[PDB]
Structures are given as C-alpha cells and as structure tokens.
Amino acid sequence: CVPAQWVHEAKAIRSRRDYLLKGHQKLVTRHLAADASFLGELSNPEHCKHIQLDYIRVIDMLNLI
Amino acid sequence: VSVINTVDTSHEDMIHDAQMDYYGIRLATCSSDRSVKIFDVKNGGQILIADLRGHDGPVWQVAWAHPMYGNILASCSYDRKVIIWKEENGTWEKTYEYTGHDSSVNSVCWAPHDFGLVLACGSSDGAISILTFTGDGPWEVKKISNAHTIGCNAVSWAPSVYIKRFVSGGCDNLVKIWREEDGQWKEDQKLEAHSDWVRDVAWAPSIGLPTSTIASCSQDGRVYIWTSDDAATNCWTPKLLHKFNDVVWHVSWSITANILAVSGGDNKVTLWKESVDGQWACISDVN
C-alpha cells in the first residue's frame, strides 16, 4: 500500500480487539501503576520523554534511581 | 391479522433483533422473554456466554458500541428502560441504566465512533433520549420531547463524511432528519412519503461517496430510498424500491455494494442492489 504512517493505526486497532508500545509507535500512568519488565518500563519512560504527567515521569526516574 | 399468525406458528424460535459484534466475534440477541443473550461465533458455531436478564418487558433492538470504548452493548425495551452492559474480564455487569422515557423504547443506535460515545434512543411516547459519555460513570441526557406525533420506531445515525445528521422514522409517517446547533438538536427536515407508520429507517454508510442515501420501510409495505444529490442542498428526493402487499419490518445496508436487506412481507427477506440504470432490483430470495 502507498506509504503512509497508517501501520501504527492498524496495529493499534488489532490490540484493542484482543500493545502500549504499538500504540506509542493517563493510560501510561495506569500501566505504571499496574507495573508498580524493568526494561519494558524503561522503554515506556523513554517513550514518555519522547512525547514530552511530568511529575509521574519524575517519580518513575526516582524509582529507577 | 389474527388469522395470518395462527397458520404456521413455527417459532423455533421467536427473537426480535440480533446484531453481530465489531470484529465479527460475538452475537448479541434479544427475544420477547426479556432476555439479552450474548453468543460467540468462532468458526460458524454458536456458543452462549451470558443471559443478561433485566427488562420488565420484551427487548426490542440491540446495538454494540465501538471497541475503542472497551466492550459495551446496549439494549432497549418495552419496559421504558435502556440498559448499557460493560465487560471487565468476563464481568458482564451493567455500568449504567436510563429510564427517562415514559413509554416503550422501540430503538437504539450508537453515534459514529469519532463523535464520542453517544447513544440515541427513540421512545413510543414520541421522544428520543440521547446518552453522552463523560469521564467516569456519569451520563448526561439530551432529550427531544414530541419528536414524532404518536411515537418513534427507528433511529439511525448517518456515517461521518463538525455537523452530525440523524434521520428517524415514527408512527406519524414522517421520517424526520435531525441537526444540532449550540448544543441541542433540531429537526432539519421532515420526509412524508409513507401512507402509514414508518417501521425502520437506515442511513446507508457512505463509501467515501458524497451522495448520502437513507432507506425506509413502513406498514404500507413500501420501501423508499431517499437520496441527496449533493452536499449542503436540503433536497431529499424519494424513490420507490418496491411495494409488497404486507408490512416491511426491517431494512439494513450491506457495507460495500450498498445492498439493501429488506426484511418483511411473507416471512421472507430480499436482497436489493441498485442497477447501472438506477432502478433497484432483487438479487435473490434468502432462506
């Protein structure tokens, strides 16, 4: 199919039917709460940094410390 | 009337409406026993998952919400109430219930998923209540009183192509379309072509195409495919699909080709495609 950034959009829909990383490619905070693995958390933090909840990010950094 | 029903009495079994899930996984049903059964169809085999009981009267129509809001199903009934069932890990509990109409609730439909999570509901009192989702479990209602003269049967939301237009039929013979201004809804137009009670009214999905169509069926036994020639011109020109000697109960649009499934008349359901000549034709007899 002709190039467009529609791949993330299709992948995200599939995940909903049946994930967070795919969506990246409130909810994040909830995910962190569920994950009160470590590498995945670091990746999520990196994604948050890319997006930049700031206080939550700071808390995550403190946890990493 | 009484004579026709007693002739076969096949049953096996009576049900009103039943709609497939998005993603084609589940199949919610409802029947006159007040029971909202959710089946699952993996590989073509029907399997029951839950019998959501909770209506004081027979459930009428049923509609799945978009999977972007989790897994939600709403059903209305003759009990004057509408139920919204959420799902949390197989936890099919009702997260909200609405009882704002004084007479039976003939139909429900979900707004196209972009507008949010809006549910539109037409009563038999002549009022339709719309439920809009907020942050948590609050649901604020935008009610239209005296929408149709003796009650409403159908509610349908046209696919998005901003401004949202909804066309509904009722038992005054009028297929009213709807428009919203500052916040409340107003009747953009009335459509009088039926000689008796409008049964169902389906707003065909736009194939990206701007020539928006709507289908309607009534007690007169006629099916009309009302058309709008262009965007922003208040011209709905009706065109007769067919007339049967008996009532037409339900009308539904097939997604791609705009094939009309005409349910009604003689216990038979017909399929129709508009020819290359603009006349509608029956493709086949189902059953």
mmCIF file of all heavy atoms in Angstrom, chain A residues 13 16-17, chain B residues 23 67-68, unseen atoms left out:
data_model
loop_
_atom_site.group_PDB
_atom_site.id
_atom_site.type_symbol
_atom_site.label_atom_id
_atom_site.label_comp_id
_atom_site.label_asym_id
_atom_site.label_seq_id
_atom_site.Cartn_x
_atom_site.Cartn_y
_atom_site.Cartn_z
ATOM 1 N N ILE A 13 -5.499 -0.921 16.456
ATOM 2 C CA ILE A 13 -6.871 -1.410 16.409
ATOM 3 C C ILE A 13 -6.937 -2.897 16.739
ATOM 4 O O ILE A 13 -7.838 -3.346 17.448
ATOM 5 C CB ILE A 13 -7.509 -1.170 15.028
ATOM 6 N N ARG A 16 -6.609 -3.562 20.497
ATOM 7 C CA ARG A 16 -7.831 -3.239 21.223
ATOM 8 C C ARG A 16 -8.838 -4.381 21.146
ATOM 9 O O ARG A 16 -9.503 -4.702 22.131
ATOM 10 C CB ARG A 16 -8.453 -1.951 20.681
ATOM 11 N N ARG A 17 -8.945 -4.991 19.970
ATOM 12 C CA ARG A 17 -9.871 -6.097 19.762
ATOM 13 C C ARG A 17 -9.512 -7.289 20.642
ATOM 14 O O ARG A 17 -10.390 -7.947 21.200
ATOM 15 C CB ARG A 17 -9.884 -6.515 18.290
ATOM 16 N N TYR B 23 -15.547 -6.630 14.664
ATOM 17 C CA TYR B 23 -14.535 -7.684 14.559
ATOM 18 C C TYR B 23 -15.103 -9.078 14.277
ATOM 19 O O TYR B 23 -14.348 -10.035 14.160
ATOM 20 C CB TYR B 23 -13.550 -7.712 15.775
ATOM 21 N N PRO B 67 -15.378 -0.829 19.682
ATOM 22 C CA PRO B 67 -14.384 -1.469 20.554
ATOM 23 C C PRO B 67 -13.323 -0.538 21.121
ATOM 24 O O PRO B 67 -12.575 -0.932 22.013
ATOM 25 C CB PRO B 67 -13.686 -2.484 19.644
ATOM 26 N N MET B 68 -13.236 0.706 20.614
ATOM 27 C CA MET B 68 -12.438 1.804 21.135
ATOM 28 C C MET B 68 -12.818 2.220 22.558
ATOM 29 O O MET B 68 -12.015 2.819 23.268
ATOM 30 C CB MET B 68 -12.588 3.027 20.192
#
